[PDB]
Amino acid sequence: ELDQLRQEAEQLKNQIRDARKACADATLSQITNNIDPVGRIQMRTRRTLRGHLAKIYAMHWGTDSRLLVSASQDGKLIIWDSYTTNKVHAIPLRSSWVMTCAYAPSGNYVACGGLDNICSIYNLKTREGNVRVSRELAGHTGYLSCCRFLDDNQIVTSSGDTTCALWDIETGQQTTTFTGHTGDVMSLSLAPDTRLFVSGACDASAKLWDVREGMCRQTFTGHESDINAICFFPNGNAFATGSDDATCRLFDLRADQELMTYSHDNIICGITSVSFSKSGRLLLAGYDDFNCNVWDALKADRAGVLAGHDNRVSCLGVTDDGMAVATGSWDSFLKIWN
Amino acid sequence: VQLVESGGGLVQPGGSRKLSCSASGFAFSSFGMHWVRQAPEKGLEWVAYISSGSGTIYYADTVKGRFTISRDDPKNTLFLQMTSLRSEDTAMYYCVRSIYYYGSSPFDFWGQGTTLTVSSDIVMTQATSSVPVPGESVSISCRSSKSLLHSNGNTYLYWFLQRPGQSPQLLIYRMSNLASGVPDRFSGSGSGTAFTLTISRLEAEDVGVYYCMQHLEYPLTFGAGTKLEL
Amino acid sequence: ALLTAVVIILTIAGNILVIMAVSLEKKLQNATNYFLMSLAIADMLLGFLVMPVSMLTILYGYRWPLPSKLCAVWIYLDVLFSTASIMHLCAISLDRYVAIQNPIHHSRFNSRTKAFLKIIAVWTISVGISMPIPVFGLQDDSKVFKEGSCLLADDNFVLIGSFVSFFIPLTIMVITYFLTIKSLQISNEQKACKVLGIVFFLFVVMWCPFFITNIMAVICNEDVIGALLNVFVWIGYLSSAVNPLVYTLFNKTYRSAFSR
Amino acid sequence: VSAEDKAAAERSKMIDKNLREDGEKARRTLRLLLLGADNSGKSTIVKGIFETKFQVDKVNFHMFDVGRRKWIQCFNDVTAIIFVVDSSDYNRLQEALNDFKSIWNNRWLRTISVILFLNKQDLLAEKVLAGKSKIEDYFPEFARYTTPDPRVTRAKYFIRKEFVDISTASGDGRHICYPHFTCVDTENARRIFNDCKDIILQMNLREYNLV
Amino acid sequence: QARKLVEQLKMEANIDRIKVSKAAADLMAYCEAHAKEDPLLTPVPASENPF
Ligand SMILES: C[C@H](c1ncccn1)N1CCC[C@H](c2ccc(O)cc2)C1
Structure with a gap:
C-alpha cells in the first residue's frame, strides 16, 4: 500500500541522524583552541571602476588575475583591465534582465543569462574584430540563476525551475539533468577537481552532485531560511554557505555534517555573497546592510570590515593568486581591496 | 576579411x-x-x-x-x-x-x-643578409641600439615573414607570442636588447625574408631583414 | 549692543549646522541641496566678515575707528553678500514653480549641470552688480566717506542698485508665487501652499522697509530717516539667520541631523 | 606609459562616450510592471517575459509581464505597478486580495505606487441586475453596506472599498493607490498618464522640502 | 514519487564517515602548511603588490 512509503522514509531519516551523531567526538572550536589569532586586518581600496549607469548584479575574475567581467541593469557586459582600469570591451545585451555572468577558464568565451530562460555564449576572439553570440542555450522553464564553464565545450547552469543541467556547446543540447531540489535553485560551485559540484536552494538545503555519474551523493540541511551563495574550501573537502538566516555555515564532506557557524547578536540582515582566501584561514561575506565582514575561519572570531559602498553589495570574488578582493554594488561602482 | x-x-x-x-x-x-x-x-x-x-x-x-x-x-x-x-x-x-x-x-x-x-630613432640590425637553409633547424638574430623591455613587463618586438611576390604577414608579437594560423614549429626569445627566432624542421614555403620591428615608441623602425634560400 | 551679537551668533550657528548636515549625510546629496549649501555659505560669509564691523561702528558712535583706506572694502563685501542671497531666493522660488507646474519635464533634465549653471549665473550677477564701487570709488573721496562715517554717496548708483538688486526680484517672486498658488489650487499640496506663503511673507516683510526708506532718502526730516535705517538694516541682517532654518526644517531628515 | 598603453587608453575614452550617449536615450522613458491572475483581462487592458510600448502626450512607456518572491527585487525602480482584478466572480475575489496584500507590503517595494484596474464591470452589471447570486454569501458586510443604476452602484463601490481599505490600513505615506473601472473600452492609456504625472509631482514636492 | 525518495534516502544512509576530530585536524593542517602563501593573511611588501 502507498502510505507505507512515509513509514520507510521515517526509518531512514532516523538512521542518517544516528550515523552523523556517532562521528561527533570533538568540535572544530575544541580542537583549534590553542592556534594563534589573525589579530586585526585592515584592507584598503586600491581601485574604483566607473562606467555602469545602473545596479551591478554580478562579476567574475579571469584566470590570469588581471581581467574581470561585470553585468548590469543598464543592458551591458563590460570587460575591464583591473591594473590600469581600462575597458577592453562593452557588449550589448538582447534583454535588460540579466542575473548572472561567467568567464571561461581559457579566456576565449564569456556567458550570461537571466529572466528570459536562455544562457548566451559570447566569442571574444573573432577575425572580424567584434564580439558576437556563438550559441543560445534554451530548455529551462524558469529564470537562470547561476552558470559556470568546465572547459571551452561544457557548461553547467541552474534555474528557478528547480533543476540544474550540463550542456554540450557544439551540439546546443543537454547531456545530463540534475533533479531533486523542491525550491528554486539560487547558486552553484564547482569542486577544484571538476568531478563534483554543490548547489543551494530556497528549500534551505544544499546537495553534492557527481558530474560524470549524473546523480546526488549527499544532502546538507542546517539553515532555517533561503541560501543565496555557496563556495568550496581550497582543499575541495569542505564548503561554506550564506543565507537569509543572517548566518554563514561551514560543512564537511567526509564527516557528512556542519562543523561551525558564523554569526553575532549585532548582525540582522541577509547574506548576498561568500568567498575564501587562498590559505582558507579568512572567510569573506557580503551583506544587505552594504559592507563586508571578514571572519577567522578556524576561531570563528571577526577580524575586520570592508566598509565603503552606500548601497547593498551584490557580488564578491578573490583572485586565484590571492592578491586582491573585488566587490560590486547597487550603487553602480565596483571596488578592489588589498 | x-x-x-x-x-x-x-x-x-x-x-x-x-x-x-x-x-x-x-x-x-x-x-x-x-x-x-x-x-x-x-x-x-x-x-x-x-x-x-x-x-x-x-x-x-x-x-x-x-x-x-x-x-x-x-x-x-x-x-x-x-x-x-x-x-x-x-x-x-x-x-x-x-x-x-x-x-x-x-x-x-x-x-x-x-x-x-x-620619375633619437631606435637603430636595429640583422647581422646576416642571406642564409642557405630542409628538415634541419634554422635560426635568425636581431639587435637593438636601446632596451625594448618596459617597466610594465612587456617587450615590444615583432617578426614579419614575406614569401616571394606576396605582401608580408605576422609571425610573432611582443617577443614571444605566436600569431593565429602560424605553424607551431616557429619560436623566438631574447634579452632587453638582443633577440633570436628559431625555425624547427624547415620546409618549402618557409623560404622568404624575415624582418624585425620595434613598437616601443614612434617612429616605428625596422631591421634590414634576412633572406633564406632552399 | 547685545542684540547684534546674538544675531551674529545665530547666523554662524545655523549656517555651520546646515553645512555639516549637507556635507556629512548621504541621502541629502541631490542636485537641489547644493544650492542650499551655497546659500548657507553666502550667509556665513555675510555674518562673519560684515556684521561685527557694524557692531563696532555702533560701539564707536558711527565714526569709522579703524584705518580709513578700507571704507570701500566693507561696503563692497556687504553689497556682494546681500545681492547674492536675494538672487538665490529668487532662483529657488522660480525653480520650485517650474518643478510644480511641469513635473515630468523638470524631472527629465536633472543632469547635474542645472545646479552649476544656476550657481554660476547667480554669483556672476552678484559680482557684476558691484562694479562702480571698486572702479570709481576707491580713488574717489566724496563717494564712500560722508562727514565722519563710511556710507554710500552716489544717488544714481543707490537708485539703480535698489531697482535691480531688489525690485526686479520682488516682482519676479510676486508673479511666480501667484502662478504657483494658482497651479497648486490633496493633503500635501495644501502643505506646499502654506510653506510657500510663509516663506514669501517672511521675505517681503523683513527686507522691503529698508529699501523703501533708503529710496525715500534719495527722492524726498533728516535724522528720522537715518534712525529708521539704522534699525531696518539690522532687521535685514537678521533675515540671514532664518533662511537656512526655514528652507530645511520642513524635512524630517534635516531635523534628525540637526538633533544629532 | 608605452605606445601600446596610450592607444589602449584612447580606446577606453570611446567606450565611455558611447556608453554615456546611450544613457540619455533610455532615461527619456518611464517603466511599468504589469500584474494579474489568469482570465483577469491583463493582456487587453490597453489595445519567458513579454514587453509592450506606447506613447501619450509626448511621454513614452515600457510595460513588462512575466510568463514571484525572488525576481520581484529586479523591479525595485519602476514608476508604477499596474494591478488588474477580475470583478465577474465573487468566489476567487479573496485570492485577488491575498495577492494584492502580498505586493503592497513587500520589503523591496516600500516606495512604489499602484494603479488598480477593476475589470469586467459589464459582467458585474449583468449579474447584479439578473440577481441569481449575492456578494453577501462571500463578503458578509455587503448585507449592511449602502452607497456613499441604483442596484449596481452598491456592489461596485463595496468591491472597490475592499482593496483601498487593505492598502490604507498600512500605507506608510511614501506610496499611494489609484483605482479605476474597465469594460470595448479605449481611454486606459490616458488614465495611466494622468496618474504617472501625479506620482512624479508627489516626488518633486518632497525633494524641494515642501512636504 | 515516494518509490524514488526512499531509494535515495537508503543510498545516502550507505557511505563511509570519518570522526569530526580527524576532519578538523585535516583543515587545520592545510591552513598551517599554506600560512605564507596568502597575501591577505600576511601582507606583501609594498613593491610586490600589482595594485
Ligand atoms: C550696510 C549697507 C548700508 N547702507 C545704508 C545705510 C546703512 N547700511 N548696506 C546694507 C545692506 C545692503 C545695502 C545694499 C544692498 C543692495 C544694494 O543693491 C545696495 C545697497 C547696503
Whole structure:
C-alpha cells in the first residue's frame, strides 16, 4: 500500500541522524583552541571602476588575475583591465534582465543569462574584430540563476525551475539533468577537481552532485531560511554557505555534517555573497546592510570590515593568486581591496 | 576579411596624388590603420598612422608636411594625399590594420599594395643578409641600439615573414607570442636588447625574408631583414 | 549692543549646522541641496566678515575707528553678500514653480549641470552688480566717506542698485508665487501652499522697509530717516539667520541631523 | 606609459562616450510592471517575459509581464505597478486580495505606487441586475453596506472599498493607490498618464522640502 | 514519487564517515602548511603588490 512509503522514509531519516551523531567526538572550536589569532586586518581600496549607469548584479575574475567581467541593469557586459582600469570591451545585451555572468577558464568565451530562460555564449576572439553570440542555450522553464564553464565545450547552469543541467556547446543540447531540489535553485560551485559540484536552494538545503555519474551523493540541511551563495574550501573537502538566516555555515564532506557557524547578536540582515582566501584561514561575506565582514575561519572570531559602498553589495570574488578582493554594488561602482 | 588598393602609377617630379584602400568583412571603424612602404631593393619602412575615431595622427620626418592621411568610415575607406613627389618616394605602398587593448595582436593583416614610380630613432640590425637553409633547424638574430623591455613587463618586438611576390604577414608579437594560423614549429626569445627566432624542421614555403620591428615608441623602425634560400 | 551679537551668533550657528548636515549625510546629496549649501555659505560669509564691523561702528558712535583706506572694502563685501542671497531666493522660488507646474519635464533634465549653471549665473550677477564701487570709488573721496562715517554717496548708483538688486526680484517672486498658488489650487499640496506663503511673507516683510526708506532718502526730516535705517538694516541682517532654518526644517531628515 | 598603453587608453575614452550617449536615450522613458491572475483581462487592458510600448502626450512607456518572491527585487525602480482584478466572480475575489496584500507590503517595494484596474464591470452589471447570486454569501458586510443604476452602484463601490481599505490600513505615506473601472473600452492609456504625472509631482514636492 | 525518495534516502544512509576530530585536524593542517602563501593573511611588501 502507498502510505507505507512515509513509514520507510521515517526509518531512514532516523538512521542518517544516528550515523552523523556517532562521528561527533570533538568540535572544530575544541580542537583549534590553542592556534594563534589573525589579530586585526585592515584592507584598503586600491581601485574604483566607473562606467555602469545602473545596479551591478554580478562579476567574475579571469584566470590570469588581471581581467574581470561585470553585468548590469543598464543592458551591458563590460570587460575591464583591473591594473590600469581600462575597458577592453562593452557588449550589448538582447534583454535588460540579466542575473548572472561567467568567464571561461581559457579566456576565449564569456556567458550570461537571466529572466528570459536562455544562457548566451559570447566569442571574444573573432577575425572580424567584434564580439558576437556563438550559441543560445534554451530548455529551462524558469529564470537562470547561476552558470559556470568546465572547459571551452561544457557548461553547467541552474534555474528557478528547480533543476540544474550540463550542456554540450557544439551540439546546443543537454547531456545530463540534475533533479531533486523542491525550491528554486539560487547558486552553484564547482569542486577544484571538476568531478563534483554543490548547489543551494530556497528549500534551505544544499546537495553534492557527481558530474560524470549524473546523480546526488549527499544532502546538507542546517539553515532555517533561503541560501543565496555557496563556495568550496581550497582543499575541495569542505564548503561554506550564506543565507537569509543572517548566518554563514561551514560543512564537511567526509564527516557528512556542519562543523561551525558564523554569526553575532549585532548582525540582522541577509547574506548576498561568500568567498575564501587562498590559505582558507579568512572567510569573506557580503551583506544587505552594504559592507563586508571578514571572519577567522578556524576561531570563528571577526577580524575586520570592508566598509565603503552606500548601497547593498551584490557580488564578491578573490583572485586565484590571492592578491586582491573585488566587490560590486547597487550603487553602480565596483571596488578592489588589498 | 579583405583590404584592396587603388592609385599608384607613374608621376612627373613635383606633382601630387591620392591613394585609396577599401575594407570589407570587418569592423573597419574599430581598427587603427598604417601605411607601410618598400623601395624596389630595400626593407620595409613605416610612413604614417591614423587611430580609431581619427583622434591622433603620426608621420615619419621624410613625409611630414608633404602627406595627409585620412579615413571615410561610412564608406570603409582609407586615404593618403601626398604632394611634391620626388624620385625618393618611388615605392610599393601597403595599408595595414591594427588594434590596441590588453591581449591584442597589431599588424594582423596587410593589403596588396599599389606601386608608385616618380620619375633619437631606435637603430636595429640583422647581422646576416642571406642564409642557405630542409628538415634541419634554422635560426635568425636581431639587435637593438636601446632596451625594448618596459617597466610594465612587456617587450615590444615583432617578426614579419614575406614569401616571394606576396605582401608580408605576422609571425610573432611582443617577443614571444605566436600569431593565429602560424605553424607551431616557429619560436623566438631574447634579452632587453638582443633577440633570436628559431625555425624547427624547415620546409618549402618557409623560404622568404624575415624582418624585425620595434613598437616601443614612434617612429616605428625596422631591421634590414634576412633572406633564406632552399 | 547685545542684540547684534546674538544675531551674529545665530547666523554662524545655523549656517555651520546646515553645512555639516549637507556635507556629512548621504541621502541629502541631490542636485537641489547644493544650492542650499551655497546659500548657507553666502550667509556665513555675510555674518562673519560684515556684521561685527557694524557692531563696532555702533560701539564707536558711527565714526569709522579703524584705518580709513578700507571704507570701500566693507561696503563692497556687504553689497556682494546681500545681492547674492536675494538672487538665490529668487532662483529657488522660480525653480520650485517650474518643478510644480511641469513635473515630468523638470524631472527629465536633472543632469547635474542645472545646479552649476544656476550657481554660476547667480554669483556672476552678484559680482557684476558691484562694479562702480571698486572702479570709481576707491580713488574717489566724496563717494564712500560722508562727514565722519563710511556710507554710500552716489544717488544714481543707490537708485539703480535698489531697482535691480531688489525690485526686479520682488516682482519676479510676486508673479511666480501667484502662478504657483494658482497651479497648486490633496493633503500635501495644501502643505506646499502654506510653506510657500510663509516663506514669501517672511521675505517681503523683513527686507522691503529698508529699501523703501533708503529710496525715500534719495527722492524726498533728516535724522528720522537715518534712525529708521539704522534699525531696518539690522532687521535685514537678521533675515540671514532664518533662511537656512526655514528652507530645511520642513524635512524630517534635516531635523534628525540637526538633533544629532 | 608605452605606445601600446596610450592607444589602449584612447580606446577606453570611446567606450565611455558611447556608453554615456546611450544613457540619455533610455532615461527619456518611464517603466511599468504589469500584474494579474489568469482570465483577469491583463493582456487587453490597453489595445519567458513579454514587453509592450506606447506613447501619450509626448511621454513614452515600457510595460513588462512575466510568463514571484525572488525576481520581484529586479523591479525595485519602476514608476508604477499596474494591478488588474477580475470583478465577474465573487468566489476567487479573496485570492485577488491575498495577492494584492502580498505586493503592497513587500520589503523591496516600500516606495512604489499602484494603479488598480477593476475589470469586467459589464459582467458585474449583468449579474447584479439578473440577481441569481449575492456578494453577501462571500463578503458578509455587503448585507449592511449602502452607497456613499441604483442596484449596481452598491456592489461596485463595496468591491472597490475592499482593496483601498487593505492598502490604507498600512500605507506608510511614501506610496499611494489609484483605482479605476474597465469594460470595448479605449481611454486606459490616458488614465495611466494622468496618474504617472501625479506620482512624479508627489516626488518633486518632497525633494524641494515642501512636504 | 515516494518509490524514488526512499531509494535515495537508503543510498545516502550507505557511505563511509570519518570522526569530526580527524576532519578538523585535516583543515587545520592545510591552513598551517599554506600560512605564507596568502597575501591577505600576511601582507606583501609594498613593491610586490600589482595594485
Ligand atoms: C550696510 C549697507 C548700508 N547702507 C545704508 C545705510 C546703512 N547700511 N548696506 C546694507 C545692506 C545692503 C545695502 C545694499 C544692498 C543692495 C544694494 O543693491 C545696495 C545697497 C547696503
